[PDB]
């Protein structure tokens, strides 16, 4: 028996008792339903309101249809798709904008055709697996077209029409199977060189500069003189090079892209928001790709056309995901010869591409190459110390380490900004191991492989060399100069260096672990294997020396300066005077300052992000810099006061002057003269702060009834709880690993320093350090000289062999 | 002109060009639409599928309607509500379960009535603000009813029917305005005592034990003898006490509640999932409240009925949110006299409620009270050291500190588990300052107030005492014993103590800062103000001594033991022998071990959660415990070897024997004898580990056209980005504050220790430490004696004054 519940939702508060008996008797609910007339008025109002559709409602219904389709529920998807298609078809007539009307009409027709196909599939007429809306790319005229633009030859269709398509491909390996195609393949062009420009949260100016530099490189390639020994021949000749080059600009997510970048892209005809909103309504695409042959004009000079494909990902992932999409999809479809990777803002010189291609074509044993990386405008604003220190570090690292490693044909790390490979040595296993993280969950891999995060360059570089049944070697080209932009503040440098150091350490450990694969699996010459063994020994010694660097720096500074002051070993002054208080005071002050600084640095680094601790980092860096400058002046005075000896001059040369000798040999000596002091002032800051912050923040990484409804809710809750538990366990394991590594490193350094400062004297310790440093620098100088000899001799001597 | 796009969605890949001209010509789209017959088949299939509705579809449509209503879009809400109501009305007949059929029919009728009311409101007939679906509570029979249960007197409606209602009230202050009512108010009962039992992720056994203990307390109150001086009279008499007590069980979220807890609650007739799923479909309620008068039977004894209200929150928030709901809504509606707060698992003795109520009624100057908190089964499993240490700490803290602070009528912290207030001294400003975090965003408050997180008890306790135009004092009742459950492992204790220590430190700073409000604003007696001034001086000295505790412990251990060994100051042995190597070796080993342990502890604490670092924490704790035990044995030997003096015996008494004297005075001496060694073995662990982990993890805390659509998307994106930036800035500020505090604390301790160990000797330092400790313990002993004298005298001497 129904109670008096006729007015229950209208009244503010109603209390009712609902008995569970033997269900409500029939013929009573009918009277209650039929006795209400307000329902008729409500239905009339709803029908009046629902007569006129809206664009937003149609788009929302299509989005819901896509969400239902992704959940493998097909009848609801069909109903929602039909509703959305009819709504869009009705709306299209009302709109006054011609472009909007045309897009709405086309989308409505496409949705209705997809509804028909899905209905046929449900009935069983069509037998397919995982049916999805058919691929349909739309070409529209570009809003801005430059009438005053002179080019080689442009078809009107190619010159005035920009093409768009949304891609749903979840695994990029299946891009070609799902039926997606690029304009280059359709037009019959077969590009031989591909360039990828990863982008994320960047201003328009950087992208404009990068595109201008690429256009200048293409122009330089076009004007190459024919009939010369040094001229490229074939697919990279003149007047037709631009048809063999494709530029893929991959963005990392619509949410984080700077709006002015989107405005600039729309200006050059590579992005349109209305088309993206309309044509991607029901697809639920993972990515949106626009295609054009863009034409750029700078000042009164018109550049060459660039065949550009702009791929914008809906969500946000890592740069490795952008490389995944680029390599797998575009390379496996186009099948090019070379493959260049660069970042946004990397401005190239006119001859960079020419030098890379010349090396690749002439040598032919090269599976990868990297150019020289420089700091833009180093001399300008010379008063800044961080910029000059970075310039010195880049120059010295390039010369010495890159030359030494390129002599043996194995470069430890390709920069990842302006590097190149050939798509024959990386097609198989090297790329599979490159994207191991993206294909396997971090739970299975473990903490060691997972913490090798942002170290992907070294993984690819090592996998190329040690490939089974192949002998691919890497190379370093000096003349391919690319200028980047560096942070102007200490905090920016500290933030930047963390990824570099984590990746370097763990990739170095991986390479040391797996170096045997070169001899066990690869197919190299015996001479190459012996050279690799020598380089392996040198690499082990260098890494071992670099692991104990803070302790060695502390010991050197302490012994030389402060125990020379305390125990009368400075030569330009005598400390046999003084009241025995200053002599101990110097050592005590040094020890207390060093220990307090290290404690503060480790607390800050393990504690918080280095953005709100700007003042404290600046203070610690200033203290260490003043200490290092004072120590350098004292050491210079000591060296010049000594009457000099053969051993002294030999050690001084092989320790310090190797930098100047190599720089003068390669002709880049003025930069060293300008920036030597600035780099010297930041050595302890570099070592201590960067290593501590790298180790401390190692954790950072990426129909049914009622019972069916209840079961679904319970299953969803259980799955969510299991997922949360798994994520928690993963984070626990990675935190444990990073803490163990940091404890081992710090305690090893402390124990070494204490044992050497208590049981050893300066006279019985300093010669060993001098010998070690001299040996390392002698090896590096020999490597640099060998690289210079090769680069200046092999060109002439290739005729002999 | 339309292209050949008839087959575009069906085909795998189609390329089309959509010209933007002057829109598609008319009379061409009509032919294309009318030339397709597959649309008719698709429409027929959709109509056939959509003829039969489903429960899940109706619930989903109602949920979408609620979401639209919360967005203030009313026409779409009306349409979706009508669709859902009609769907549920149609479905109700098909279902075979009588309860489901009745609930579906009632929900359909209620939804249709709400649709009519909303239509009238839209037309303008009804003038209201923020209209919502009318409040409608449903009473249903309980599934399990105990026929064999003897009680005082139960109405059949109250005994067999459980009531449910969903509440949407966003601000709990408006609970009574929106029209929600409780069964107690409807029935005319006016409870005088309310008990809140906060729950989150708990097993059934703890809740069962808590309910059994509460029933036993009610039974003890019922059997109170009449016509006695010590017997309560009035609303807490016999045979009718159960009608004046209400128990509110507040849960923290459906997602995290243990399923067995829900099963047990459904067993006792306090939860039903079907009713919750059906009746909360379209309301979008913030909380769901069930009401019952539960009857519990344990073994062959039948307990008393308990008037229970179970409030389950949809989402998850803090315990402060549960207190917000409880206090504001239920207290402001019922308006009780007293208000007791306890946690789940707090098992009470039979006389706890009687003692609390007796104190409140007889004294009448008390605005809050707290009972004694004990560890359940302390003697059992005595081999565990953590449990015994916690038992000793609880007993000593209770006796000394609670007695001393209760003598002055100001208890620093009420436990929050088994505490009580009176709803006259907290109604206004104290509760407003209690929930300041929940009403004001943490951005405005700042880092100091925000970091006072989980310190709410101290805030309420201080706000009660210093209330303007009132003189409320707090009290401590010794006989109200409540037994809790403590962690059995070191890691659990470390995890638990962080909240306590953070809250204690920052609330203590706040109280010290704002102590002047008692004299400036409150209205106390002059004697009370002088006593508060004395207590303020003592509080300042105690806090200052506690801030420098690690340094003092290190200095005491070092000086006494290790410099007695090195410099021949142990009395039971002479070290004038030995080869001068062991004498320095002892000090060097002690210093190195202490420093390495502290470094490891700070690295681990600031780095990772103390759940995967179990072994390292255990190792450090074991090292410190062995050190402390050795030091204690050496000190005992030194003390017993000395021929003793008046100064020596006085210092020894006032330093160590105060614990035993006070414990014997209060009769709880055997526990001290059993647990003294266990507490002594963990003092350095307590101090160092708990303080470091507390300071390191301080950061932890809680119609339209196309252009309108584009504007909406852009506005949503901009709002999301601004929200993300604000959250990032807030976290940055709080991290900076915690790091500054930790650096200040650690460096102050280190500098103090170094300066005192270099410029001071043991003979010129130890007497000062002895005097300080003796003074503090003398003050605490005097406080305990005064409290005992009061509690044993005032009862007899109240006749005089
Ligand atoms: C630092 C680097 C350059 N200034 C840079 O910042 N490169 C970024 C990077 O490498 O992270 C680019 O990576 C992409 N990116 C970034 C974040 C993200 O979440 N997703 C994403 O795709 C963006 O395009 C971003 O420009 C410089 O040239 C350099 C110097 C020496 C060297 O040995 C290597 N590199
Ligand atoms: C530790 C305490 C008791 N063992 C306990 O654990 N209490 C919890 C707490 O206080 O946090 C309860 O708080 C609620 N809670 C918890 C988390 C959440 O996210 N939400 C939420 O509501 C839960 O009911 C939870 O049982 C013990 O009795 C005690 C001893 C001495 C003392 O001075 C104070 N207390």
Curated annotation (Swiss-Prot), chains A, B:
Enumerate the residues binding UDP-N-acetyl-alpha-D-glucosamine.
198, 202, 252
| Documented EC number(s) | 2.4.1.16
Q: Provide the effect of residue 343 to A.
A: Abolishes the catalytic activity
* One BP annotation, GO: chitin biosynthetic process
**A GO cellular component annotation in the UniProt record:** plasma membrane
The protein's predominant localisation is membrane
Residues linked to a glycan: 381, 471
Q: What keywords does the record list, in alphabetical order?
A: Cell membrane, Cell wall biogenesis/degradation, Glycoprotein, Glycosyltransferase, Membrane, Transferase, Transmembrane, Transmembrane helix, Virulence
Localization terms from the record: Cell membrane
UniProt activity-regulation remark = The activity is inhibited by nikkomycin Z (NikZ).
Q: Which reaction does it catalyse?
A: [(1->4)-N-acetyl-beta-D-glucosaminyl](n) + UDP-N-acetyl-alpha-D-glucosamine = [(1->4)-N-acetyl-beta-D-glucosaminyl](n+1) + UDP + H(+)
UniProt cross-references to SUPFAM superfamilies, sorted A to Z: Nucleotide-diphospho-sugar transferases
Provide the effect of residue 497 to A: Greatly impairs the catalytic activity
Kindly list the cofactors needed. Answer: Mn(2+)
- The active site is formed by 457
Tell me the impact of changing residue 252 to A: Abolishes the catalytic activity
**Source species, domain of life:** Eukaryota
Induction conditions? Expression is low in the mycelium and during most infective stages except at 48 hpi, but increases in sporangia and zoospores, and peaks in germinating cysts.
Q: Which cysteines are joined by disulfide bonds?
A: none
Q: What is the effect of changing residue 415 to A?
A: Greatly impairs the catalytic activity
Q: What class of enzyme is it?
A: transferase
Q: What happens when the gene is disrupted?
A: Reduces mycelial growth rate by approximately 10% and retards sporangial production and zoospore release. Also leads to significantly reduced virulence.
Q: Where are the transmembrane segments?
A: 500-520, 542-562, 586-606, 619-639, 645-665, 672-692, 741-761, 766-786
Q: Which family does it belong to?
A: Belongs to the chitin synthase family. Class II subfamily.
Annotated function: Polymerizes chitin, a structural polymer of the cell wall and septum, by transferring the sugar moiety of UDP-GlcNAc to the non-reducing end of the growing chitin polymer. Involved in mycelial growth, sporangial production, zoospore release and pathogenesis.
Protein's UniProt name: Chitin synthase 1
Organism, scientific name: Phytophthora sojae (strain P6497)
* Taxonomy of the source species: Eukaryota, Sar, Stramenopiles, Oomycota, Peronosporales
